[PDB]
Amino acid sequence: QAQIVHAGQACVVKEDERVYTIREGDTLMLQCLVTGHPRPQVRWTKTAGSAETSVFNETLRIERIARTQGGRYYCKAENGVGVPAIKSIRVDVQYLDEPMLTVHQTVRGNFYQEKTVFLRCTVNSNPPARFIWKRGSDTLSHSQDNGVDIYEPLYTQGETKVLKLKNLRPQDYASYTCQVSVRNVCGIPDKAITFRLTNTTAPPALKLSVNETLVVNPGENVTVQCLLTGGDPLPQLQWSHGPGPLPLGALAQGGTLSIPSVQARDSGYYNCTATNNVGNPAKKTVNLLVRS
């Protein structure tokens, strides 16, 4: 004598069955309807592993749903008459983050005449994103300009796509844009990111104003500089310590690391890294040591 049907007439995105497809952050509301000769109990349970995280009202409402809240739900009528009623919904919470473009020249010697450059684009999106590569305002492919390849590498779960420039022609040194699209499933618009490849594009190189292992007495003033010796797109520099952070230490500019006073707690490694998405980041280490 216990039946249930739920309406999904909330502020949810439209599409031209059993799936509730909403844009991320939008307001979700699902209306469970019961039917019984005795008044049955309502339950809105999220499928979470267990051999009270459930809303017991007829309406399951969440104002701001993230990816974490995009599992499978189901409502249930507990009425003593017969089998309890169960109806399930897959809440598909969709989004489209911002793309990340990184150049990779993969170089020692210059013995071969190849000059090959890779452009890897990466996104995070609930709908598997569609990738469109452009050179300026030219959506390019291999059938259009055979000097390039385009492929999606396996074992990366399809969240990335690579544009290969096999041999750099003068026309290759241009502006490339990765444009990612979810096909406007929730009205989510396409995004894009751009990189300028030029004759001087190169990964970063770092210069350290101290030796590798820096020996310091307690109470002294320590200042280490991180200097740049390479990287055409202006690299960004950051310092780090590792296991235990230091309260005295400050990093006013990305290059300057400052420790006002030194105690044996402050000993250890201090890694300065420069990262401009062109190659492997540059890492220079200062092994700060305090006598004892």
């Binding site: 059993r18 499928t47 051999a51 499978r72 249930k76 089998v83 399930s88 897959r90 396996l154």
Partner: protein
Amino acid sequence: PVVNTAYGRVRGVRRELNNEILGPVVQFLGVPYATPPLGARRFQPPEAPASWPGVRQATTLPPACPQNLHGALPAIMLPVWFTDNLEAAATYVQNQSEDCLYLNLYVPGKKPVMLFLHGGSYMEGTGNMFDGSVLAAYGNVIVATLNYRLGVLGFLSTGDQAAKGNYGLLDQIQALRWLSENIAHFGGDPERITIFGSGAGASCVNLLILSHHSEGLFQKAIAQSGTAISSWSVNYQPLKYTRLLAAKVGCDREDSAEAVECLRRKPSRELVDQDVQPARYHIAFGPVVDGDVVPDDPEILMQQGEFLNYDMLIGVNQGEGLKFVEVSASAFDFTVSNFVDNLYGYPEGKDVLRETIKFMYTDWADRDNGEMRRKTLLALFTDHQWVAPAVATAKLHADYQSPVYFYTFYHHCQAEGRPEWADAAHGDELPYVFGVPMVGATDLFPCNFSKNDVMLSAVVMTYWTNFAKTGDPNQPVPNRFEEVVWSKFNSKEKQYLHIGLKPRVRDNYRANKVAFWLELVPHLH
């Protein structure tokens, strides 16, 4: 030995086992757990059974569900002992009526419950073949064997609302509810219920793991050589074969409710005798994606984490698919060709897939003789149908912090045409699970049991019952297995227990082949 239930009173029967160490048990053969699905209730979910005022005398095995073992059996996916001993199996199904929704209990302070979902191919079998009294008297556990609706009367679906399907699975759920609110009368524990099955029954086990209707019914699950993602696990063309069968029995009406309506009139004898040939390595009538008891595709359900954290014990035999091989290089090419065309939907690129599969399963240290070709075919079917889906299921469930324990059965039982040097085929793990070596070779399992068989049977029974008790197969009750710790299974380590005469715990079973079928073959097409 009379016990009252919420419906009626039942008289059992106490029997002594053929073992001097194992004592007696109390058997309840044929208690009804659902109303007979006879007229309007054919092609309908199972409701609660009736109530009898007197004492029903359940001292005889109940009838098996309507079957047909005469002609056209799925020997490829059937247990080997079943296909070899069709007479000793047919004696168990001489009594067939559509009123077959009964179960059998085997009882030796709340004891754990262990219900066995018998498998095969969804169109035959019965729980009466499995005398759980030995497993009960050894394990200190109650053993249940039910009978669910088979084939047409159990899984016919139209993809519409006329016949949602999965009626046999719903019978299993109804028996789970029956035991949940009636095993306490037998001294059992409704809070320590464990289901276990082999073959298609283990497929049903994983399905009930993914189902909402089994929410409060059981806690642990054991899949033995069966998975919900294999080619024959789920029917994805229900209306096709339902309309073929309907055309066979003069029931082809373009309205699904009317075709279902005439199908309810035709007698079960004339429905089960019809043989609707399915596609190769598929099924014509089986579990379907109704959107209710199976919310969506089982693989999608396991990838999206839309399930509960049951305790799973999966495992595969070494040489399942023995019937698949029973080799010329040309024959190898042909069977790989039909393999690719049938299991991959005649895909563009079937030449690349076929040639790289023939390469991957060809030991090149000797590519001349056909014995090795037979070995690589056996490994081919064993890997694609059983090993890879098992590892994928254990991985996906273990990723969401479900405790999983993986086993690989290597030692089998010696019978005629089944020499002890050959590989453990499909279904050869059941004799050790049901303590067959400890009571003598039945006519269905005519094995030359040795002391090793008895001791190994005690070991695997110990593992299974321990799992039913505490969720760890080796914790309650611990002579080759010395201090072997059946470690857990997670996607990092992927550790499994190698069950056999020489046991050990290894970290990655067939990792290259599993990664081949899982991570590379899909991109090919």
